[PDB]
Amino acid sequence: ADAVLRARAEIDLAALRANVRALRERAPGAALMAVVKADAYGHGAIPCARAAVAAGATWLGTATPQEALALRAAEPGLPDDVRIMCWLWTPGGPWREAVEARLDVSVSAMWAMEEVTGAARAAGVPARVQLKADTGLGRGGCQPGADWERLVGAALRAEEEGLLRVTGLWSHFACADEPGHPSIAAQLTRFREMTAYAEQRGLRPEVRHIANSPATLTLPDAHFDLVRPGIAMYGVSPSPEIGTPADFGLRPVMTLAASLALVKQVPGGHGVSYGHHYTTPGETTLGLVPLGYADGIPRHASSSGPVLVDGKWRTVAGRIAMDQFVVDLGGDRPEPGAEAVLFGPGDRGEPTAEDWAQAAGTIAYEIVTRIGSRVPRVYVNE
Amino acid sequence: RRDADAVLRARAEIDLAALRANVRALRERAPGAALMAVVKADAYGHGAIPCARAAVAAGATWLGTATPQEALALRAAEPGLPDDVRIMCWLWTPGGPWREAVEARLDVSVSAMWAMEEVTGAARAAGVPARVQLKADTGLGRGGCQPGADWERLVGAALRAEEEGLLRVTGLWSHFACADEPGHPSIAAQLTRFREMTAYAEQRGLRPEVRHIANSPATLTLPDAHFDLVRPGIAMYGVSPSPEIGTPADFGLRPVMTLAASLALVKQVPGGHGVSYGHHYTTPGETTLGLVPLGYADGIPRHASSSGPVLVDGKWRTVAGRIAMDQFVVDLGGDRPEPGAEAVLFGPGDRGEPTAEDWAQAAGTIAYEIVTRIGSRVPRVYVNE
Ligand SMILES: Cc1ncc(COP(=O)(O)O)c(CN[C@@H]2CONC2=O)c1O
Numbered sequence: 001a002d003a004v005l006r007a008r009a010e011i012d013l014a015a016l017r018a019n020v021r022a023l024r025e026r027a028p029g030a031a032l033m034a035v036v037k038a039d040a041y042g043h044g045a046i047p048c049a050r051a052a053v054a055a056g057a058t059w060l061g062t063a064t065p066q067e068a069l070a071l072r073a074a075e076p077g078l079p080d081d082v083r084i085m086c087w088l089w090t091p092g093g094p095w096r097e098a099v100e101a102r103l104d105v106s107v108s109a110m111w112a113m114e115e116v117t118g119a120a121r122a123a124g125v126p127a128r129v130q131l132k133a134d135t136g137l138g139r140g141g142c143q144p145g146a147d148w149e150r151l152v153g154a155a156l157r158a159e160e161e162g163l164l165r166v167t168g169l170w171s172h173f174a175c176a177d178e179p180g181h182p183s184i185a186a187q188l189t190r191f192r193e194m195t196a197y198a199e200q201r202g203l204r205p206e207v208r209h210i211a212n213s214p215a216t217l218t219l220p221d222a223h224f225d226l227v228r229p230g231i232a233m234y235g236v237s238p239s240p241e242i243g244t245p246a247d248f249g250l251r252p253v254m255t256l257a258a259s260l261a262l263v264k265q266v267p268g269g270h271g272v273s274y275g276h277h278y279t280t281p282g283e284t285t286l287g288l289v290p291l292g293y294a295d296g297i298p299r300h301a302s303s304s305g306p307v308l309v310d311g312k313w314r315t316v317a318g319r320i321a322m323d324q325f326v327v328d329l330g331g332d333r334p335e336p337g338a339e340a341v342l343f344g345p346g347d348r349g350e351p352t353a354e355d356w357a358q359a360a361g362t363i364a365y366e367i368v369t370r371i372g373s374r375v376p377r378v379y380v381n382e
Numbered sequence: 383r384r385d386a387d388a389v390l391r392a393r394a395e396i397d398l399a400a401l402r403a404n405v406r407a408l409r410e411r412a413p414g415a416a417l418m419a420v421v422k423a424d425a426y427g428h429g430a431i432p433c434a435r436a437a438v439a440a441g442a443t444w445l446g447t448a449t450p451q452e453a454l455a456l457r458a459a460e461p462g463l464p465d466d467v468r469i470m471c472w473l474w475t476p477g478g479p480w481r482e483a484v485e486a487r488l489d490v491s492v493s494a495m496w497a498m499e500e501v502t503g504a505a506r507a508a509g510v511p512a513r514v515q516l517k518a519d520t521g522l523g524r525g526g527c528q529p530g531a532d533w534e535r536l537v538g539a540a541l542r543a544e545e546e547g548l549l550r551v552t553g554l555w556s557h558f559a560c561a562d563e564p565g566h567p568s569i570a571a572q573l574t575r576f577r578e579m580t581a582y583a584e585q586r587g588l589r590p591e592v593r594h595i596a597n598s599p600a601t602l603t604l605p606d607a608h609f610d611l612v613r614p615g616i617a618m619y620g621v622s623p624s625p626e627i628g629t630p631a632d633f634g635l636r637p638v639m640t641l642a643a644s645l646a647l648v649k650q651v652p653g654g655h656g657v658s659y660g661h662h663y664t665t666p667g668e669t670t671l672g673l674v675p676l677g678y679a680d681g682i683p684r685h686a687s688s689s690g691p692v693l694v695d696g697k698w699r700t701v702a703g704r705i706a707m708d709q710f711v712v713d714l715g716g717d718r719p720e721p722g723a724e725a726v727l728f729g730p731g732d733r734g735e736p737t738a739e740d741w742a743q744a745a746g747t748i749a750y751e752i753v754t755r756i757g758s759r760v761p762r763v764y765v766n767e
Pocket residue numbers: 035087172211212213214228229230231232238365705706707708
């Protein structure tokens with residue numbers, strides 16, 4: 001692909017492996033799940049899954065069943081013994097294909113309990129089921145009290161019939177990226193209660209797990225049998241409040257770069273881009289970076305996004321357009337085709353994804369995950 | 383059946399009859415001009431090839447893309463689009479596939495000497511002449527050639543390449559900065575500069591088939607800016623360029639995309655229960671919550687946290703707290719739709735659902751960004767092909 005000449009997202013799989021390594025050291029009591037949903041947070045699902053497994057991940061996590069099934073179908077195959085879990089299900093989804101593919105499937109509700117049991121019955125092989133507990137996030141889990149009682153009950157019956165085995169009990173935190181937030185302790189308490197209850201009724205899960213990246217990095221009591229450090233595996237800190245990648249032995253995996261399309265002199269008083277929200281203060285040079293919001297450069301970073309060009313940080317001049325944006329180069333005259341580095345690990349003087357997050361009023365998770373399909377991915381150290 | 387399966391979670395429904403109607407409506411609105419169907423960025427999220435075909439059927443005689451790869455993909459479509467449709471691309475960088483573009487008969491934009499040298503080199507090596515459009519920077523300060531010496535030199539090099547039989551300048555074009563703000567003084571200033579820079583080029587000897595400057599908001603509001611060709615991108619997808627310009631209905635337009643999902647969970651929760659990351663929403667009393675299985679990886683902007691609208695079970699709901707990567711929650715106020723019930727995030731608006739403009743407002747952006755960044759994990763379903 002000559003598509004890389006315009007722009008590319010370089011994915012350093014050696015950095016990803018080092019991150020997995022570092023996260024395994026940080027959670028020595030637990031298995032590590034490589035969360036590779038959303039096309040591995042924009043980094044490429046299958047290449048990142050292989051690298052994570054090579055570095056010691058024994059679980060893969062996806063949102064949709066289609067994502068998990070694509071991992072099972074990869075050629076050459078990932079090891080047959082890697083566990084693959086998926087959790088974002090709707091009525092009528094491919095439960096039977098998931099059971100036949102030996103996926104761990106999350107169940108938060110009776111409807112899904114019924115459908116997976118029906119699918120196991122029709123497939124003639126038992127399902128592996130994880131029960132999700134809503135411990136305080138108020139999102140995908142089963143509520144405590146009657147809902148949980150009923151769900152645990154139906155799971156035991158299906159076990160009795162040989163239709164499934166409950167392989168895990170899990171939940172997810174709301175505010176683990178704010179250390180000391182009182183909801184963290186409240187959720188852990190509730191997690192302990194709800195899991196104690198399920199085990200006393202007779203469930204025998206292989207894994208209990210609640211930890212995402214910020215809990216993995218800051219709460220050893222929340223590690224249990226399995227940690228799910230998604231954003232950290234891609235070398236990106238969950239928040240500045242938690243710390244920098246370097247604080248945890250982490251290195252950003254993605255570098256986003258483009259080649260300048262145009263370098264041109266313009267007079268003072270010349271408007272730049274839509275709405276003319278920037279006006280040259282005097283005679284100067286403008287550089288055209290051929291990436292825009294269709295490529296995942298957030299429109300919210302208009303006037304603020306940083307980019308390394310020709311030895312200095314520049315910032316976006318005025319509005320980001322669909323396919324491009326402009327920087328004021330202050331008189332410098334790099335060649336057309338010169339490298340513009342939007343973000344990376346930061347060790348060459350370039351910005352990081354967290355700098356973009358700040359410029360766009362969002363979090364670094366969104367920045368890396370929404371880099372568009374029009375930007376080719378280049379895998380290094382595969 | 384694998385098709386039938388991903389649509390169960392969510393889908394972006396693309397009504398090509400609405401797109402064809404929009405192209406007809408735009409052609410009425412610019413009777414002096416050919417219409418270019420701007421299908422860059424995967425047709426603003428709607429699907430490049432299906433939209434290109436529909437637009438051509440409805441009378442578009444030009445297709446516009448940003449990258450050469452987009453344009454080459456249109457040339458290569460099977461079945462082919464008509465051989466006589468013109469396909470233009472404009473976002474080039476040094477060393478791009480100029481020769482392949484020349485051999486594929488694309489119109490290629492040039493704003494600079496580097497590019498003039500590369501395309502002339504490629505035409506020389508291919509042994510076939512290039513079709514080149516010169517872009518003028520009339521005030522936008524983005525991709526065009528500046529007036530004065532830069533333009534003089536570019537027009538000069540183009541004439542020499544014409545003299546050698548290496549290319550023909552097929553167009554002279556530009557693009558507006560503020561056409562979405564009617565009466566903004568930059569509009570007239572750019573048109574005046576466009577007229578001068580194009581007059582200059584023609585008097586030096588260039589004979590373009592088309593002159594063009596109009597995007598959607600100019601096409602809709604500025605008949606003097608139509609020239610020989612209009613490029614109404616967002617309007618073709620039935621979306622107004624701004625509320626200042628008007629609503630789609632004001633222009634005989636209908637939104638082409640409908641974004642919908644199937645509820646993944648409906649559950650009862652007590653009062654005082656936090657909802658989603660950071661607990662920016664707390665249930666005020668006992669209630670029901672609905673889980674919509676779409677998140678910012680699917681293109682639901684995180685900026686619409688606490689504000690995005692969605693039609694569920696007969697009423698508009700709004701996002702409760704933070705939108706997550708793969709899902710968000712709504713407070714259903716006690717209602718108990720079935721799991722799997724339809725949640726309509728946006729569409730043309732005639733069934734009581736929100737529009738892409740409502741999402742733009744909720745997310746502090748423009749409707750262009752909403753439709754364009756709907757993620758590849760959302761399948762597109764084409765109706766009225
Ligand atoms: C159920 C589940 N487990 C673990 C993770 C890993 O989170 P970290 O990436 O924070 O480690 C996530 C993803 N969290 C994303 C981030 O945005 N919204 C989500 O659902 C998730 O949804």
